């Protein structure tokens, strides 16, 4: 198989992998390359992808993983996966504005993938545990050519149910929930607490998506894309910065005045976003309810 793998241009990178466009048996792929220092994230990500029943319309498609020794005497680990020309949701939102229906399509498809990730499927030979993503954000979501999302980057994800479990501030700082910023996640109910951390981050993703919805800025132009909290903390905020703004001061991204609350759809959208990122983690929507709320919003478009 992998003797015929060709790497082309670099298309992305984060803390753990450098991601290249590639060719495998003359078909296009993406190749995430890890150094030996990040081997454990490769191991983790590969094994999450190989958990039974992980193939799903809103989960990135994994092909194969592999190791090689480089010319200069270094170990490299390669995670080969489907190539998504649109890239991350972050990149896609910076380039596109969408109307109500297509914005809901982005938001619903990412929510559907998270609800599936979060759901335990007792199946013996095919057991799928509930899995927490642990760094959910729009750079770890990819956008398919048909305009729907897939969840990606399981380098930090953890199994939450079943046997041989372990108990664990390692995510992306901008998207950390308040209880994480306080070091006070309730690890006694570990399964629920980790899902609630994910759900807070999904709320921020909702805000980022709908800030680029052409129908929410009528008679006006859509603001340029900005990540959650960028106007308030800039790029690369510090842990302490986020702690004061998000947890101490109880702040969240702001809904524009242009979302004048006389529309029933807009009022409902705002309440669903707020039900995801509230301070009381036990009171946030679950992923399965957010998926249903999102679909019910679309249905309240008639
Ligand atoms: N299969 C893919 N197709 C297209 N772009 C990708 C793909 N996987 C990752 N990327 C891009 O590479 C970036 C980093 O990939 P990711 O797997 O998140 O690495 P890290 O674990 O280092 O954050 C993503 O934000 C995205 O822009
Ligand atoms: N069919 C099953 N598949 C997966 N996990 C199961 C099944 N039945 C029970 N369990 C769970 O597996 C756990 C046992 O894990 P084990 O590896 O024995 O210990 P630990 O997780 O403490 O290291 C129990 O808490 C139980 O809830
Ligand atoms: Mg990263
Ligand atoms: Mg490692
Ligand atoms: Mg695992
Ligand atoms: Mg990433
Ligand atoms: Mg935050
Ligand atoms: Mg429900
Ligand atoms: Mg909607």
Residue numbers in the entry: 199 to 366, 376 to 509
Task: Give passages from the manuscript.
Remarkably, several of these mutations (C483R, D485G, D487V, A490D/V, and R491W/Q) cluster to the C1 dimer interface in the BMPR2 kinase domain, specifically at the αH-αI linker. Two sites of PAH mutations—D487 and D485—stand out because they make direct interactions with residues in ALK2 in the C1 dimer model. D485 was not included in our initial mutagenesis and was of particular interest. The D485G mutation is highly penetrant in PAH, and previous studies have shown its dominant-negative effect on BMPR2 signaling in complex with other type I receptors (ALK3 and ALK6) in cells. When the D485G mutation was introduced into BMPR2KD (BMPR2KD-D485G), the recombinant BMPR2KD-D485G did not dimerize with the wild-type ALK2KD. This mutation also had a dominant-negative effect on BMP4-dependent SMAD signaling by the ALK2/BMPR2KD-D485G full-length receptor complex. Due to prior speculations that loss of the acidic charge at residue 485 compromises the kinase fold, we obtained a crystal structure of the BMPR2KD-D485G kinase solved to 2.3 Å resolution. The BMPR2KD-D485G structure revealed an intact architecture of the kinase domain and overlaid with the recently reported structure of the wild-type BMPR2 kinase domain35 with an RMSD of 0.5 Å over 279 Cα atoms. Moreover, like other C-lobe mutants tested (BMPR2-EED and BMPR-EDE), the BMPR2KD-D485G mutant exhibited enzymatic activity comparable to the wild-type BMPR2KD. Thus, we conclude that the pathological effect of the D485G mutant of BMPR2 in PAH patients is due to loss of the receptor’s ability to engage in C-lobe-mediated heterodimers, which results in loss of downstream signaling.
